[PDB]
Amino acid sequence: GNNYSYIDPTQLPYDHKWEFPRNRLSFGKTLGAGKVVEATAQGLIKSDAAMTVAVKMLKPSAHSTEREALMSELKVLSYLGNHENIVNLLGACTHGGPTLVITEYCCYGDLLNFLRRKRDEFVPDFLTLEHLLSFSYQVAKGMAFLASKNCIHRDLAARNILLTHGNITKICDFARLPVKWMAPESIFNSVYTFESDVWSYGIFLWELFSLGSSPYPGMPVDSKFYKMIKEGFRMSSPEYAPAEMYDIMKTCWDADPDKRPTFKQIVQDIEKQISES
Ligand SMILES: Cn1cc(-c2ccc(CNc3cc(-c4cnc5cc(OCCCN6CCCC6)ccn45)ncn3)cc2)cn1
Numbered sequence: 042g043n044n045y046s047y048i049d050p051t052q053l054p055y056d057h058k059w060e061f062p063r064n065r066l067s068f069g070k071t072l073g074a075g076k077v078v079e080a081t082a083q084g085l086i087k088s089d090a091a092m093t094v095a096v097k098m099l100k101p102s103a104h105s106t107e108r109e110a111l112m113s114e115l116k117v118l119s120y121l122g123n124h125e126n127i128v129n130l131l132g133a134c135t136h137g138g139p140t141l142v143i144t145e146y147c148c149y150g151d152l153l154n155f156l157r158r159k160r161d162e163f164v165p166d167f168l169t170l171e172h173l174l175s176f177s178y179q180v181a182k183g184m185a186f187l188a189s190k191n192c193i194h195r196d197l198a199a200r201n202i203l204l205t206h207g208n209i210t211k212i213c214d215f216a217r218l219p220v221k222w223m224a225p226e227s228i229f230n231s232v233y234t235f236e237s238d239v240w241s242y243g244i245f246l247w248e249l250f251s252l253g254s255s256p257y258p259g260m261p262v263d264s265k266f267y268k269m270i271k272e273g274f275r276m277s278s279p280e281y282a283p284a285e286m287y288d289i290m291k292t293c294w295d296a297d298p299d300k301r302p303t304f305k306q307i308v309q310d311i312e313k314q315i316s317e318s
């Protein structure tokens with residue numbers, strides 16, 4: 042009770058093993074916007090070698106609470122540790138300021154823009170169906186890893202999944218809310234859990250197997266949208282979605298969060314699909 046408590050990663054001190062000289066960073070083009078830029082890190086991993094990285098930083102007009110928020114994200118990434126399917130922390134510039142968060146660089150960018158570019162050149166260097174099951178499998182693995190560290194993402198979507206060399210997908214994270222990806226309990230009661238992440242993973246699967254279509258097409262976010270979602274309206278199967286994968290989406294979209302599968306259940310379900318190829 043009083044003697045045993047969860048260890049809040051945002052309350053732990055910043056570990057200076059991540060500290061990197063900011064004069065060894067040369068910023069390039071902006072990757073996204075709290076902007077993220079491409080940069081060359083001189084001597085980051087090897088002393089005599091430059092390395093392309095991504096650097097997250099706040100807008101110059103960010104105030105006191107925004108500055109501490111970026112530090113908390115840094116501490117969470119440090120507490121999570123390295124994993125194959127997340128955009129891994131590589132270093133930070135914290136002395137003096139402004140805080141710079143150095144992470145892995147993924148040359149292909151976000152998965153949503155990637156799928157829309159490969160939309161034509163798709164057949165079940167060509168995007169295929171084996172890639173789509175691999176992508177769905179790797180994202181569930183990363184989310185299972187997050188769930189194992191008592192961390193929920195709260196903005197899982199194709200736009201927050203990056204692609205790098207070797208077709209490795211990595212989970213990342215770039216008030217206004219992503220309504221069409223949110224579980225009903227998040228929209229109506231503002232609660233976020235492991236299960237609401239699973240709901241968003243189901244929406245991600247629909248983006249993936251439709252080659253990047255916007256979810257709920259032709260439906261604006263309005264009174265009719267909320268009414269239909271609450272009454273049980275769900276999207277139908279995407280054009281390129283296997284039957285066993287659509288069965289997963291339906292379970293992720295269960296109105297009862299306790300009936301939704303866990304990411305640990307999802308990974309081994311997709312494992313049996315890949316195995317029986
Ligand atoms: C599990 N979990 C992870 C976090 C997490 C991790 C990391 C962070 C900060 N780091 C980043 C990094 C990048 C990034 C890396 N590589 C690219 C490459 C890009 O595109 C270039 C390709 C050009 N286009 C392609 C063709 C046309 C032009 C774009 C962005 N990125 N994006 C955002 N934040 C924050 C949170 C939180 N929970």
Ligand SMILES: [Cl-]
Nearest residue numbers: 047048191192
């Ligand atoms: Cl907890």
